[PDB]
């Protein structure tokens, strides 16, 4: 937004474009250049950059399958950093009566009785204001990730488990890999309900077990 011209040679200055006019500090100053103050950056960011990424559906489904297998292997749940102290079994299955839960108090009662409220409490304690200029751009806090409750349908357990800090909610009808493997890291604690568990392989259309080398 300037009418800057280059002064040329024969003048004892560099040959950068300079502000036309006079009578102010801005006059004569270099413009139109990454190297210049107030001048455009190098290769200004365009809005038609590729922001999204394309993954074939087969590969996304394979990612979901593998994230679930790693959730089933518990020497990775603890590796990712969950407390399996009070966890009786892995994978964690839960009676369908919790899908009719209405209170966060009953949700925490269930999570205590099963052994994931340790993770919830860890997340709640370690919740902090985000480090380094992320807190300025509407990302105020850095919250860790606790258990993942996978329900069979849209039910009340969503509002039940909603406020609990680390807990995320999901459904077998649409299993989100951003929740099954957050950060790209694998082995997250999942607390499937009984019908969700029974429908896992039906939804994911898994017919056999794979013969994997040992």
């Amino acid at each position: 937004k300037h009418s800057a011209e280059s002064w040329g040679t024969g003048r004892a200055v560099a040959r950068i474009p300079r502000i036309s006019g006079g009578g102010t500090h801005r006059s004569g100053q270099g413009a139109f250049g990454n190297m210049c103050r107030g001048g455009r950056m190098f290769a200004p960011t365009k809005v038609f950059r590729k922001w999204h990424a394309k993954v074939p559906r087969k590969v996304r489904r394979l990612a979901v399958r593998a994230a679930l297998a790693a959730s089933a292997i518990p020497a990775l749940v603890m590796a990712r950093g969950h407390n399996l102290e009070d966890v009786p079994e892995i994978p964690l299955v839960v009676p369908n009566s919790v899908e009719a839960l209405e209170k966060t108090k009953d949700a925490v009662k269930l999570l205590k009785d099963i052994g994931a409220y340790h993770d919830v409490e860890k997340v709640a304690a370690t919740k902090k204001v985000r480090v380094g200029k992320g807190k300025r751009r509407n990302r105020r806090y850095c919250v860790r990730k606790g258990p993942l409750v996978v329900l069979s349908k849209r039910c009340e357990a969503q509002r039940a488990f909603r406020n609990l800090p680390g807990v995320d909610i999901n459904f077998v009808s649409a299993l989100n890999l951003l929740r099954l493997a957050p950060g790209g890291h694998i082995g997250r604690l999942i607390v499937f309900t009984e019908d969700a568990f029974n429908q896992l392989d039906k939804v994911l259309k898994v017919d056999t077990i794979e013969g994997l080398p040992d």
Binding site: R40, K46, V47, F48
Partner: protein, 219 residues
């Protein structure tokens, strides 16, 4: 230009397509696709709620075969039924058909009896699945309507009928194994093809031949 073997560029970006400081650009970024999907869905269901006790699309469209030789076998939906299909179904008033929800297209005609019969039976399964509400709520009530079809008007999402393509995807279904016919044993299909193609090429020649024959007949 490459110092290699890469193809000839053929790039086609010589005309200020780029939104720089001097140019407005020729770029349209479709970042609205995500939000517009939901907005289209919302306005579609608002259309349904507006014209509620009726199909959400609303007019019965005919089924016509796609146009060219490449898409002959594929069927699809038309714009409206021909007045011959209407008269065959039992409707002789295009405006009444339209008011009860059958779409009309006087531009279209039936170039064959198959389309006529297909869309006629389409309209006839319509007008039987159809529950007309009576005007002024308490006068005459048509046949079939049982006084609780009016109590329970249900808006179906798709129009009862199968998919449009499921009408060519049924004509494209072979028969059971069969015996050959002696004409199917004697017939040479490649010879027939070559014959009917040489036919269109030997026309003026098959006139000059007759002319020579009759000249020699004179002589």
């Amino acid at each position: 230009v490459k110092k290699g073997n890469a193809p000839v560029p053929n790039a086609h970006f010589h005309k200020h397509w780029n939104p720089t400081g001097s140019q407005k650009g020729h770029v349209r970024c479709f970042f609205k696709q995500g939000p517009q999907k939901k907005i289209r869905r919302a306005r579609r269901q608002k259309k349904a709620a507006a014209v509620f006790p009726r199909p959400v699309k609303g007019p019965l469209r005919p089924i016509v075969h796609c146009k060219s030789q490449r898409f002959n076998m594929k069927t699809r939906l038309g714009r409206g039924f021909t007045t011959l299909e209407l008269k065959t179904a039992g409707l002789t008033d295009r405006r009444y058909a339209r008011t009860i929800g059958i779409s009309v297209d006087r531009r279209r005609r039936n170039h064959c009896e198959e389309s006529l019969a297909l869309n006629a039976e389409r309209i006839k399964t319509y007008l039987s699945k159809l529950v007309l509400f009576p005007l002024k709520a308490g006068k005459k009530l048509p046949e079939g309507v049982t006084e609780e079809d009016i109590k329970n008007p249900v808006q179906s999402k798709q129009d009862g009928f199968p998919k449009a393509s499921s009408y060519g995807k049924n004509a494209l279904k072979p028969e059971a194994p069969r015996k050959l016919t002696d004409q199917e044993k004697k017939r040479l299909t490649f010879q027939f093809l070559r014959k009917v193609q040489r036919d269109t090429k030997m026309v003026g020649k098959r006139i000059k031949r007759k002319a020579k024959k009759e000249a020699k007949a004179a002589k």
